[PDB]
RNA sequence: AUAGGUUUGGUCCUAGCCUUUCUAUUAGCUCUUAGUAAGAUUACACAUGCAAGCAUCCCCGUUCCAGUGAGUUCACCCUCUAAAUC
């Protein structure tokens, strides 16, 4: 079947081509700060420091998944029309028991007409929130996230900025967290601000929503300027193997194109740029073999 | 509040309670109402006990419970 | 019946465990006999008035 | 639940025999102090019934809680001898040993 | 009468600014009057009392064209910690306690509005299993009752006592009768 | 400076950088050391540096020293049930001592971290009370909800005062 | 503290402020002052509407059920919010409430129609 | 200006250092008056110097007129200058515990943004000397001389992280909690580096201070501590 | 802890004077026809009795 | 405590006292509004009015709530086990 986004080998593909740069996924902190500790370490034991820090980093890295839009609840428990017109308001009923995973766990309206429903998501999100508050989120909506602030902060370069508030407040399967995340994607596509996400949790999902929306040209043309071809030919197979069917991975079968010319494939077969693919490419030939 | 020593106002001596007036229909259907919830209450508070001493019986000798205690001696035999 | 709340949180509890089956929960009444408030009570266990 | 008695079992030494089938121990316990956050010594005094008057003053013993106090303070009873006083036997080889030498070589066994 | 009170940020900008202040904070020069060597815990309530500056304002209110609002980015930093990011209390700069409120939130309106940069920590998720089978997110399968538009019990309805009893009632509760009441309405009435 | 060698030994923090929590069995332990000899050195520094670790870990147990009433040094445990575990401390450090009593007779880090998450639900956040036991005072608190007549006056339709 | 005879019942005990109230559901025994000491508290009833016109419940479910499996008792409006919930049946009173304020609405529409 | 009070001399400026007939100028120092005294009439005054970049020193000076007084204390102290090394410039490379005569300084070294909260002398010579963020406390006798001197000996004393690495032959490894686990090298030995670790000391045998103790415990509950103040 | 001896003896005696003191249902539950009260204590009937 | 003032003809040391900070009550002088919280010095003596009823009679309740701080290691844990709710 079509891999998932938790495939081991779409996550191993995604992991090496985010990258671990150690001094941005450990830049240090705007925070109440402490005295520095020192340490008198060997060569050694500067080595396995800095594996236990790559570790570290891999464990900061870890994607998060990726979830399609939740299906809105629209459930009745009751009618109980005796009820109807004796309120005013409704009552919101939420079970808060401890022991409970937030998904498993009953919340319920009382309708002034009388109705038992079942609360909506965003109900459920906001009871969830009062009653079990989790850091970094609001019970009402931050303002951040409406357009015009969303334009200021992607103007500020501070797109994970913006990921991390949306992470913090929204579900992942919500309608507003999927909406944010597509927004800011679009932003970094048009604008190129691709190694903005690199060596960070966000770039795989960032990566597979280019895929599956077949837009992977910019992104191919960052890595190739970057010298990055190892993710370029990834990327191309990552494409191919989500539409096999394609006329990319057609041709790459049919003259047997490896490495670089299934990029050449890609830019000749399905790239909205091609042209400007193939100047790329044909630049860096050119670099490589002057260097 | 008062307590049983304390004597009773003179301004009350000669008060009589009044009972207030049955509507028959509603008292009939409010006193079958009465009727068939209580009954219903009843039967969730005995599952709710059952439930309660059902818990503390497997808290107790569980097969669980059984279980962990045959491990840990083994452990620490 | 079991209250609406309450029936619905027996039936997503039987298919969380897996089960399937369709059958409605009830509350069983039949040991629950109502006795008429009238009904003669334990004169054993009455108090008495004390004297004074 | 088998027990009445808070202290079930205890170590100590033996500090008095003057009573009939009755031994007076001396208990001690680690107590913080809250303000030098250093550990000192906090005694205790138990009475142990010792029916057989094998307890001699010096002696570590260890007790054993009652079911119910036959007594007024005597709450324990003698479970054993740990260390007879002047005729100690080594745990760790079995051997009799004066302080810090051996009495009987391990070697001659 | 500040030409810069529709722009503030304009005024930071300006040469008369660079000559005042230079490259330093607008409250690095000032001073508070006090006895002892310890403070007070507190800064004054304001220096504006009706209209009217006390002897010594505050950084804020001894300049009339410094404007406290969410816009005026480049003035709100200099009264944040540019380690910590956290806001000065108002004893460190001098700012009087009515100043020092507006600040807060002045800062506080800037950050929600994404105009001025402040930490925001990487946090895990909410749940550790993100499935939506559970059926108090899915649906529950109606009662009987519920398809048939009966109410859950029989007896949430009214139903009309047969008139034996309602004369029993009548007897046991003679001289001490309201009008009998029957059927109450189906719906509410509107 | 803090009198005594070593003095941070009586620090709160060194007391509870110990990391041996034992079973409910056991009910006493006796240390049995020697002031002189190479070979009893680790036993000696167990009772220097982590007896008082041990004590402040496990307060309910019956900890005792003896000094130089056995050629050897060695550590004795008595269990509720009535069974006697010895441990010989010769050429072992205070270190590996530790380590041997942790995994002997020591709860292991799975049942510590039930005994947590277990005193971690007698605090439900979904509580209201006093800041001793609770995170919120009252519901007015909560963001979206009517807020103190304290902060904020109530309207005059929601005030007794203007409804009698 | 010994108290002769009792029980734990499950009921509101009342805090806020002067003209916001706000209540606490818990178990307590019955002759322990109202905002006094209690066993536990199983939950909370905001009876203002919020900013979303809702009157927000928590129930701690579990521990509800486990004490009255305990032998504890309820009061009336704990009784009444647990039938709005549809954890119990509907109170009898709230049933012929609703039907007093049907007459009564119906009394007065007839008025409007009278005159 | 006024200095630590309205009729106090101390902490106030007297201006840059005259041109030494050395031929050098001084534009770039700093002066500061750490003390004046009638001496039974003549003055003598104690006057530091520094400009700001880890050069800095202090002087006496005795004449029949303060202002005399002034000029010789300052020009003496622009020719016994110290050198004072700071840890990137704005604080001290570790915490520095010393007694002149009866006079006892502790310093600590602190993180960016905390400031001078030290004995009011102290900020000032501090000042003079380029360091910005430092925790210092002065016991036993507050004589304003030995507090100079014991000062300048301490900061004159502190060993760098480049002298640490070539003393022990190892890298100097800083470990910071707003950084996470991420080891930062902030030295390393010019010459070979030693193959062999630093003994693992299960427990130092280090001279504790009670005070620093009973504030991380808590125990600590003086009402002048981490009060409010002005920025220093 | 210092003996309370005449709390027990109010006690004994308290209970002596009531089982001896016993009043007899002739007495208890008497009742004024033409005020409808108990003579014993004076308190009245519900007026549902009448 | 980031400390400061004060012993001498003068310097240093030791050492007390006081200053600067934060609360509570009372007193002087002064005082516009709105919301909220809190509110005899006194276990001294108390005018007056209220603070416990309910209910087809029996019972049940008035042993609670509310008050005070006089006395003062009966409050906490474990064992056992009444009365009480189910
Ligand atoms: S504390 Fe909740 S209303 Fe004031
Ligand atoms: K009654
Ligand atoms: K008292
Ligand atoms: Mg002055
Ligand atoms: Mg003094
Ligand atoms: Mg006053
Ligand atoms: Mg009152
Ligand atoms: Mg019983
Ligand atoms: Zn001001």
């Given at each position: 079947?079509?891999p998932?986004?938790m ?13 671990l ?7 240090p902190?705007?925070?109440?700060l402490?005295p ?6 060997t060569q050694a ?6 594996r ?15 979830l399609?839009?939740?299906v809105?609840?629209?459930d009745v428990?009751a009618?109980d ?22 998904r ?12 038992l429903?079942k609360?909506?998501?965003?109900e459920?999100?906001r009871?969830?929130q ?11 909506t ?10 200021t902060?992607?103007?500020?370069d ?5 990921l991390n508030?949306?992470?913090?407040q ?6 507003e ?13 048009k604008?190129?601000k691709?190694?903005?996400?690199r060596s960070?949790r966000?770039?795989?999902?960032m990566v ?6 077949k ?7 960052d ?8 993710d ?15 006329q990319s991975?057609?041709?790459?079968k049919?003259?047997a194109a490896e490495?670089?010319?299934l ?12 042209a ?7 630049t860096?030939?050119?670099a490589?073999?002057?260097? | ?7 009773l106002?003179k ?34 508070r005995m599952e ?6 059902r818990?503390v019986?497997?808290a ?8 962990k205690?045959?491990?840990?001696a083994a452990?620490?035999? | 019946?079991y209250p609406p709340?309450?029936?619905?949180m ?5 298919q969380k ?6 059958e409605?929960?009830?509350?069983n ?7 008429p408030?009238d009904?003669?009570a334990?004169?054993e266990?009455?108090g008495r008035?004390?004297?004074? | 639940?088998?027990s ?10 033996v ?5 009939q ?5 001396r208990?001690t316990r ?9 550990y ?6 138990y ?5 057989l008057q094998?307890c001699?003053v010096?002696?570590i013993?260890?007790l054993?809680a009652l079911?119910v106090?036959?007594a ?7 479970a054993?001898i740990?260390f007879?006083?002047g ?11 004066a302080?810090?030498?051996?009495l009987?070589?391990?070697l001659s066994? | ?10 005024y930071?900008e ?15 020069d000032?001073r508070?009057?006090?006895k002892g060597?310890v403070?007070?815990?507190?800064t ?8 009217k ?6 950084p804020?209110c001894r300049?009339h064209?410094?404007?406290?609002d969410?816009r ?6 200099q ?10 209390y ?5 700012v009087?306690?009515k100043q020092?409120k507006?600040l807060?939130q002045?800062?506080?309106?800037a950050r ?6 402040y ?5 895990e ?10 059926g ?6 109606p009662?009987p ?5 009966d109410p ?21 509760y003679?001289?001490h ?9 189906e719906?509410?009435?509107? | ?5 070593f003095?941070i030994?009586?620090?709160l ?8 929590v034992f079973?409910?069995?056991?009910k ?5 050391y ?5 070979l009893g ?6 009772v220097?540096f ?14 005792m020293?003896?000094?130089?009433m056995?050629p ?12 006697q ?6 050429t ?7 380590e041997?009593i942790?995994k002997?007779?020591?709860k ?5 971290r039930?005994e947590?998450?277990?005193?971690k ?16 005072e ?19 339709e929601?005030?007794?005062k203007?409804?009698? | 503290?010994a108290?002769?005879?009792?029980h734990?019942?499950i009921?509101?005990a009342?805090?806020?402020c ?10 307590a ?19 203002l ?6 009157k927000?419940?928590?129930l ?13 008792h309820?009061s ?5 919010l ?20 049907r007459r009564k609405?119906?009394?007065?529409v007839?008025?409007?129609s009278?005159? | ?9 101390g902490?106030?400026?007297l ?15 700093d ?6 005294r ?6 003598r005054?104690?006057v530091?110097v520094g400009n700001?970049?880890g050069?800095?020193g ?14 010789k204390?300052?020009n ?5 200058l110290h ?7 704005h604080?001290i ?10 006079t006892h300084?502790?310093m600590?070294?602190?993180?960016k ?13 501090c ?16 004589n304003?001389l030995?507090?100079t001197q ?17 003393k022990?032959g190892?890298?100097?490894?800083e470990?910071?909690?707003?950084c ?5 090298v902030?030295?390393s030995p010019?010459g070979?580096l030693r193959?062999?670790?630093?003994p693992?000391?299960?427990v130092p ?5 009670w005070?620093?103790?009973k504030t991380a415990?808590?125990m600590?509950?003086?009402?002048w501590?981490?009060?409010?103040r002005?920025?220093? | ?5 005449i709390?027990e003896?109010?006690r ?5 004077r009531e089982?001896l ?8 539950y008497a009742?004024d026809?033409?005020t409808l009260?108990?003579?014993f204590?004076?308190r009245?009937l519900?007026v549902?009795?009448?």
């Amino acid at each position: 079947k079509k891999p998932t986004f938790m495939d081991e080998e779409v996550q191993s593909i995604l992991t090496k081509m985010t990258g671990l740069n150690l001094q941005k996924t450990f830049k240090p902190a705007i925070q109440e700060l402490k005295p520095p500790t020192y340490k008198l370490m060997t060569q050694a034991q500067l080595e396995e420091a800095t594996r236990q820090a790559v570790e570290a980093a891999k464990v900061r890295l870890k994607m998060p998944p990726v979830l399609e839009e939740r299906v809105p609840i629209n459930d009745v428990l009751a009618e109980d029309k005796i009820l109807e017109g004796t309120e005013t308001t409704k009552y919101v009923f939420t079970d808060i028991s401890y022991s409970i995973p937030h998904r498993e766990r009953f919340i319920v309206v009382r309708e002034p007409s009388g109705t038992l429903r079942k609360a909506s998501w965003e109900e459920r999100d906001r009871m969830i929130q009062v009653y079990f508050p989790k850091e970094g989120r609001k019970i009402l909506t931050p303002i951040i996230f409406k357009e015009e602030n969303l334009r200021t902060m992607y103007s500020q370069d501070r797109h994970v900025d913006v990921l991390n508030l949306c992470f913090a407040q929204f579900e992942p399967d919500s309608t507003e967290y999927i909406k944010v995340h597509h927004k800011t994607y679009e932003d970094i596509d048009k604008r190129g601000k691709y190694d903005l996400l690199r060596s960070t949790r966000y770039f795989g999902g960032m990566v597979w929503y280019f895929v599956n929306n077949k837009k992977i040209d910019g992104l191919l043309i960052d890595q190739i300027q970057r010298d990055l071809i190892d993710d370029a030919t990834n990327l191309v197979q990552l494409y191919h193997v989500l539409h096999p069917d394609g006329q990319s991975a057609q041709g790459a079968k049919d003259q047997a194109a490896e490495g670089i010319n299934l990029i050449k494939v890609f830019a000749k077969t399905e790239a909205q740029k091609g042209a400007y693919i193939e100047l790329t490419l044909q630049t860096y030939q050119e670099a490589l073999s002057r260097h | 509040r008062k307590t049983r020593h304390d004597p009773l106002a003179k301004s009350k001596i000669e008060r009589v309670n009044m009972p207030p007036a049955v509507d028959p229909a509603e008292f009939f259907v409010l006193m079958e109402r009465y009727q068939h919830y209580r009954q219903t209450v009843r039967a969730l508070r005995m599952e709710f006990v059952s439930e309660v001493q059902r818990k503390v019986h497997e808290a107790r000798a569980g097969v669980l419970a059984e279980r962990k205690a045959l491990k840990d001696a083994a452990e620490h035999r | 019946p079991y209250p609406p709340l309450l029936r619905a949180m027996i039936i997503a509890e039987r298919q969380k465990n897996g089960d399937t089956s369709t059958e409605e929960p009830m509350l069983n009444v039949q040991r629950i006999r109502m006795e008429p408030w009238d009904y003669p009570a334990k004169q054993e266990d009455k108090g008495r008035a004390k004297g004074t | 639940v088998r027990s009445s008695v808070h202290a079930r079992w205890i170590v100590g030494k033996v500090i008095g025999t003057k009573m009939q089938k009755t031994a007076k121990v001396r208990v001690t316990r680690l107590v913080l102090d809250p303000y030098l956050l250093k550990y000192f010594n906090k005694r205790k005094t138990y009475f142990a019934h010792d029916a057989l008057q094998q307890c001699t003053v010096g002696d570590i013993v260890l007790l054993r809680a009652l079911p119910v106090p036959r007594a007024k303070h005597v709450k324990h009873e003698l479970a054993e001898i740990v260390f007879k006083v002047g005729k100690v036997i080594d745990p760790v080889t079995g051997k009799p040993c004066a302080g810090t030498t051996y009495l009987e070589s391990p070697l001659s066994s | 009468i500040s030409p810069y009170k529709d722009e503030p940020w304009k005024y930071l900008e300006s040469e008369e600014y660079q000559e005042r202040y230079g490259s330093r904070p607008v409250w690095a020069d000032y001073r508070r009057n006090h006895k002892g060597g310890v403070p007070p815990q507190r800064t004054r309530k304001t220096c504006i009392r009706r209209n009217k500056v006390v002897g010594n304002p505050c950084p804020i209110c001894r300049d009339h064209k410094l404007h406290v609002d969410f816009r005026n980015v480049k003035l709100l930093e200099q009264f944040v910690c540019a380690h910590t990011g956290i806001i000065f209390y108002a004893p460190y700069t001098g700012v009087c306690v009515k100043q020092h409120k507006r600040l807060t939130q002045a800062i506080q309106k800037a950050r929600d509005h994404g105009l001025l940069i402040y930490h925001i920590p990487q946090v895990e998720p909410r749940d550790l299993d993100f499935s939506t089978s559970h059926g108090a997110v899915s649906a529950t399968p109606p009662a009987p009752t519920l398809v048939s538009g009966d109410p859950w019990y029989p007896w949430y309805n009214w139903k009309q006592p047969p008139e034996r009893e309602l004369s029993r009632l009548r007897r046991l509760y003679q001289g001490h009768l309201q009008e009998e009441s029957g059927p109450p309405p189906e719906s509410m009435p509107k | 400076p803090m009198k005594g060698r070593f003095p941070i030994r009586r620090t709160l923090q060194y007391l509870s950088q110990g990391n041996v929590v034992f079973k409910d069995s056991v009910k006493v332990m006796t240390v049995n050391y020697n002031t002189h000899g190479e070979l009893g050195e680790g036993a000696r520094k167990f009772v220097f540096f982590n007896i008082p670790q041990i004590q402040y870990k496990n307060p309910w147990v019956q900890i005792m020293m003896f000094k130089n009433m056995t050629p050897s040094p060695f550590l004795r445990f008595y269990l509720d049930s009535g069974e006697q575990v010895l441990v010989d401390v010769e050429t072992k450090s205070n270190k590996e001592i530790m380590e041997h009593i942790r995994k002997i007779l020591g709860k292991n880090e799975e049942t510590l971290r039930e005994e947590e998450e277990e005193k971690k639900q007698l605090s439900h956040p979904a509580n209201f009370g006093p800041r001793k036991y609770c995170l919120r005072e009252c519901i007015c608190e909560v963001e979206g909800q009517v807020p103190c007549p304290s902060l904020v006056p109530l309207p005059k339709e929601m005030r007794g005062k203007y409804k009698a | 503290k010994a108290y002769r005879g009792g029980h734990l019942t499950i009921r509101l005990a009342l805090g806020g402020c002067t003209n916001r109230p706000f209540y606490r559901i818990v178990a307590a025994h019955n002759k322990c002052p109202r905002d006094g000491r209690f066993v536990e508290q199983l939950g909370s009833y905001d009876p203002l509407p919020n900013s979303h016109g809702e009157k927000l419940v928590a129930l701690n479910l579990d521990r509800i059920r486990h004490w009255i499996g305990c032998g504890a008792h309820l009061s009336k409006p704990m009784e009444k919010l647990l039938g709005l919930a549809g954890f119990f049946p509907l109170h009898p009173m709230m049933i012929t409430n609703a039907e007093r304020l049907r007459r009564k609405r119906a009394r007065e529409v007839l008025l409007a129609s009278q005159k | 200006e006024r200095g630590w009070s309205g009729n106090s001399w101390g902490g106030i400026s007297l201006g840059p250092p005259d041109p030494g007939p050395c031929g050098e100028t001084y534009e770039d120092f700093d002066t500061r008056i750490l003390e004046v005294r009638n001496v039974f009439k003549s003055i003598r005054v104690l006057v530091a110097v520094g400009n700001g970049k880890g050069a800095a020193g202090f002087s006496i000076g005795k004449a029949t007129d303060r202002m005399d007084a002034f000029r010789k204390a300052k020009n003496r102290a622009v020719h016994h200058l110290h050198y004072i090394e700071r840890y990137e410039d704005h604080t001290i490379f570790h915490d520095i515990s010393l007694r002149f005569k009866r006079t006892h300084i502790k310093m600590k070294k602190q993180p960016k943004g905390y400031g001078l909260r030290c004995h009011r002398a102290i900020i000032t010579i501090c000042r003079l000397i380029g360091i910005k963020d430092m925790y210092a406390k002065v016991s036993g006798s507050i004589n304003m001389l030995s507090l100079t001197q014991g000062l300048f000996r301490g900061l004159s004393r502190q060993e760098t992280h480049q002298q640490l690495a070539d003393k022990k032959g190892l890298h100097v490894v800083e470990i910071r909690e707003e950084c996470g686990p991420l080891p930062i090298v902030v030295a390393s030995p010019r010459g070979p580096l030693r193959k062999d670790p630093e003994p693992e000391d299960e427990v130092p045998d280090v001279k504790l201070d009670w005070e620093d103790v009973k504030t991380a415990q808590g125990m600590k509950r003086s009402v002048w501590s981490n009060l409010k103040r002005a920025a220093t | 802890v210092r003996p309370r001896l005449i709390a027990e003896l109010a006690r004994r005696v308290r209970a002596l004077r009531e089982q001896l003191n016993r009043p007899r249902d002739s007495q208890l539950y008497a009742v004024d026809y033409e005020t409808l009260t108990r003579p014993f204590s004076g308190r009245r009937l519900p007026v549902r009795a009448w």
